[PDB]
Structure 1
Amino acid sequence: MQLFGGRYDFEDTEVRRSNFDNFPQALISVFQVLTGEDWNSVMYNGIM
Protein backbone atom coordinates (compact mmCIF):
# COMPACT_ATOMS: atom_id res chain seq x y z
CA MET A 1 0.00 0.00 0.00
CA GLN A 2 2.84 2.40 0.80
CA LEU A 3 4.82 1.55 -2.34
CA PHE A 4 2.12 1.00 -4.98
CA GLY A 5 -1.03 2.51 -3.44
CA GLY A 6 -2.47 5.12 -5.76
CA ARG A 7 0.28 4.70 -8.36
CA TYR A 8 -1.52 2.52 -10.93
CA ASP A 9 -2.92 5.70 -12.53
CA PHE A 10 -2.14 4.62 -16.08
CA GLU A 11 -3.58 6.61 -18.98
CA ASP A 12 -4.81 3.47 -20.78
CA THR A 13 -8.06 1.49 -20.67
CA GLU A 14 -6.44 -1.70 -19.34
CA VAL A 15 -7.91 -3.18 -16.16
CA ARG A 16 -5.53 -4.07 -13.31
CA ARG A 17 -7.60 -5.65 -10.54
CA SER A 18 -4.56 -6.83 -8.53
CA ASN A 19 -3.49 -3.50 -7.05
CA PHE A 20 -2.81 -1.93 -3.64
CA ASP A 21 -5.42 0.83 -3.57
CA ASN A 22 -6.85 -0.20 -0.18
CA PHE A 23 -6.20 -2.76 2.54
CA PRO A 24 -8.47 -5.62 1.31
CA GLN A 25 -7.17 -5.34 -2.26
CA ALA A 26 -3.55 -5.18 -1.09
CA LEU A 27 -4.19 -8.23 1.09
CA ILE A 28 -5.67 -10.10 -1.88
CA SER A 29 -2.71 -9.12 -4.07
CA VAL A 30 -0.19 -10.27 -1.45
CA PHE A 31 -2.03 -13.59 -1.09
CA GLN A 32 -2.03 -14.02 -4.88
CA VAL A 33 1.72 -13.34 -5.02
CA LEU A 34 2.23 -15.90 -2.24
CA THR A 35 0.34 -18.51 -4.27
CA GLY A 36 2.70 -17.58 -7.11
CA GLU A 37 -0.05 -17.35 -9.74
CA ASP A 38 0.49 -14.46 -12.17
CA TRP A 39 2.79 -12.68 -9.71
CA ASN A 40 4.98 -11.51 -12.60
CA SER A 41 2.07 -9.45 -13.95
CA VAL A 42 1.83 -7.71 -10.57
CA MET A 43 5.58 -7.09 -10.64
CA TYR A 44 5.32 -5.62 -14.15
CA ASN A 45 2.49 -3.35 -13.01
CA GLY A 46 4.60 -2.19 -10.07
CA ILE A 47 7.59 -1.54 -12.32
CA MET A 48 5.48 0.48 -14.77
Structure 2
Amino acid sequence: GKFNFDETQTKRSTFDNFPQALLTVFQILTGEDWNAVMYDGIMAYGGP
Protein backbone atom coordinates (compact mmCIF):
# COMPACT_ATOMS: atom_id res chain seq x y z
CA GLY A 1 0.00 0.00 0.00
CA LYS A 2 2.76 2.45 -0.92
CA PHE A 3 2.39 2.66 -4.73
CA ASN A 4 -0.51 5.13 -4.43
CA PHE A 5 1.64 8.18 -5.13
CA ASP A 6 1.09 8.93 -8.84
CA GLU A 7 -2.51 10.18 -8.33
CA THR A 8 -2.98 9.97 -12.13
CA GLN A 9 -2.80 6.24 -12.92
CA THR A 10 -3.18 2.86 -11.23
CA LYS A 11 -0.21 0.51 -10.90
CA ARG A 12 -0.78 -3.14 -11.77
CA SER A 13 2.51 -4.66 -10.52
CA THR A 14 2.07 -3.84 -6.83
CA PHE A 15 2.34 -5.58 -3.46
CA ASP A 16 -1.23 -4.87 -2.34
CA ASN A 17 -2.41 -8.40 -1.50
CA PHE A 18 -0.64 -11.76 -1.40
CA PRO A 19 -1.51 -12.94 -4.96
CA GLN A 20 -0.40 -9.60 -6.42
CA ALA A 21 2.82 -9.68 -4.39
CA LEU A 22 3.47 -13.22 -5.64
CA LEU A 23 2.86 -12.15 -9.24
CA THR A 24 5.13 -9.12 -8.88
CA VAL A 25 7.91 -11.21 -7.33
CA PHE A 26 7.58 -13.77 -10.12
CA GLN A 27 7.71 -11.00 -12.74
CA ILE A 28 10.88 -9.56 -11.19
CA LEU A 29 12.30 -13.10 -11.04
CA THR A 30 11.74 -13.53 -14.78
CA GLY A 31 13.51 -10.18 -15.14
CA GLU A 32 10.88 -8.50 -17.31
CA ASP A 33 10.37 -4.85 -16.28
CA TRP A 34 12.05 -5.39 -12.92
CA ASN A 35 13.54 -1.89 -13.20
CA ALA A 36 10.03 -0.46 -13.63
CA VAL A 37 9.03 -2.01 -10.30
CA MET A 38 12.28 -0.82 -8.70
CA TYR A 39 11.55 2.76 -9.79
CA ASP A 40 8.11 2.61 -8.17
CA GLY A 41 9.64 1.13 -5.01
CA ILE A 42 12.19 3.94 -4.86
CA MET A 43 9.62 6.68 -5.54
CA ALA A 44 7.37 5.22 -2.82
CA TYR A 45 10.05 6.16 -0.26
CA GLY A 46 10.65 9.69 -1.52
CA GLY A 47 12.70 9.56 -4.70
CA PRO A 48 16.24 9.90 -6.04
Q: Does 1:34 align with 2:29?
A: yes
SS in 2 for 1:33: helix
How much does 1:12 deviate?
2.1
Query: Which residue is equivalent to 2:3?
Result: 8
Number of paired residues? 43
Runs of 4+ in 1 over 3 A off after TM superposition: none
TM-score (norm 1): 0.81
Counterparts of 2:40 and 2:21, CA distance in 1: 13
Q: Counterpart amino acid of 1:41?
A: A
Counterparts of 1:11 and 1:28, CA distance in 2: 21
Query: Where does structure 2 lack aligned partners over 5 or more consecutive residues?
Result: 44-48
Query: Where does structure 1 lack aligned partners over 5 or more consecutive residues?
Result: 1-5
Query: Which residue is equivalent to 1:22?
Result: 17
Counterparts of 2:32 and 2:21, CA distance in 1: 15
